[PDB]
């Protein structure tokens with residue numbers, strides 16, 4: 001579907017996050033072989049990344065804005081769960097997530113299809 | 115504000131009474147709970163009791179500030195605990211409700 | 222250009238960052254937004270991204286051209302959308318700020 005809320009998430013939230021200087025670890029699925037993370041998929045059962053979210057927005061995959069919001073949330077939460085508290089990637093995720101939440105605070109309130 | 119009243123009377127009210135909310139209704143007492151590393155790892159403790167009181171005392175200026183406090187509380191949980199701990203699943207469940215209700219926050 | 226300077230550094234700066242600006246920051250994409258009739262109804266599309274680029278490149282010959290582009294943008298929204306769409310309220314809010322700022326232009 002195409003809704004006011006999903007348009008906002010695409011044109012405002014994803015636009016802001018995708019071009020952020022900390023976005024690059026998150027723009028594609030984690031490649032556990034490339035990154036040397038042999039237990040990644042034992043710990044993280046629902047991988048998510050902003051490339052996948054962006055494609056779903058582009059392809060009208062989502063039915064409700066909350067579904068997109070949950071994908072963003074899963075992506076951040078995966079990072080906090082998997083990594084050590086002191087890893088810089090945690091700081092990068094926190095930074096992006098704060099922007100996510102700041103932008104979501106102004107999202108259109110009542111979702112209706114376009 | 116309209117938004118802060120929604121976060122207080124709609125979002126928090128729903129999370130507060132949830133069956134998974136009880137670990138989050140007051141600050142983590144690391145001594146009582148036997149977590150001597152908790153405050154070495156978690157530098158910004160947050161909980162729903164603290165957020166609720168801040169909502170009651172007009173502490174916030176904007177809804178986003180309150181949303182960030184919710185966010186910190188959940189994130190602390192994912193950062194501090196082992197992936198396999200039940201408390202992680204409890205936080206996830208609550209955070210999904212938080213985001214669902216936030217989606218419908220008025221403008 | 223003092224007027225165009227004002228339109229760029231005061232009017233566009235306020236409107237561009239307003240929380241209601243996001244539907245107007247780029248051209249309407251009738252394909253991606255699924256609106257087969259948009260260009261049958263709206264003959265002169267306009268948006269704040271185009272206006273902003275024109276101010277930056279010294280495109281306009283007079284302030285009135287820039288103001289008319291703002292006006293066209295808002296009018297397209299009112300003509301195309303249903304009266305109850307939130308976007309109509311968003312355009313009304315932005316246009317009132319536009320006119321308020323225009324009254325104090327050199």
Ligand SMILES: Cc1cc2n3c(c[nH]c(=O)c13)CN(C(=O)c1cccc3ccccc13)c1ccc(CS(C)(=O)=O)cc1-2
Nearest residue numbers: 024025026028029030031034035037078079082083088089
């Ligand atoms: C979600 C995610 C992304 C990455 N993740 C890693 C561990 N866990 C994760 O969740 C994770 C391992 N990883 C890092 O730790 C790392 C991060 C950021 C800056 C760095 C600077 C120096 C060294 C490492 C890093 C890197 C390295 C590079 C790429 C980009 S790409 C095109 O190659 O895939 C992605 C990740």
Ligand SMILES: Cc1cc2n3c(c[nH]c(=O)c13)CN(C(=O)c1cccc3ccccc13)c1ccc(CS(C)(=O)=O)cc1-2
Nearest residue numbers: 136137138140142143146147149190191194195200201204
């Ligand atoms: C955010 C938070 C809250 C608690 N946390 C714990 C570890 N890390 C955390 O982040 C955390 C340690 N903790 C437990 O491990 C625990 C054991 C047995 C059953 C459980 C069921 C659900 C959740 C936790 C447990 C308990 C125990 C009790 C209370 C409530 S109270 C008034 O008595 O202090 C809070 C926590």
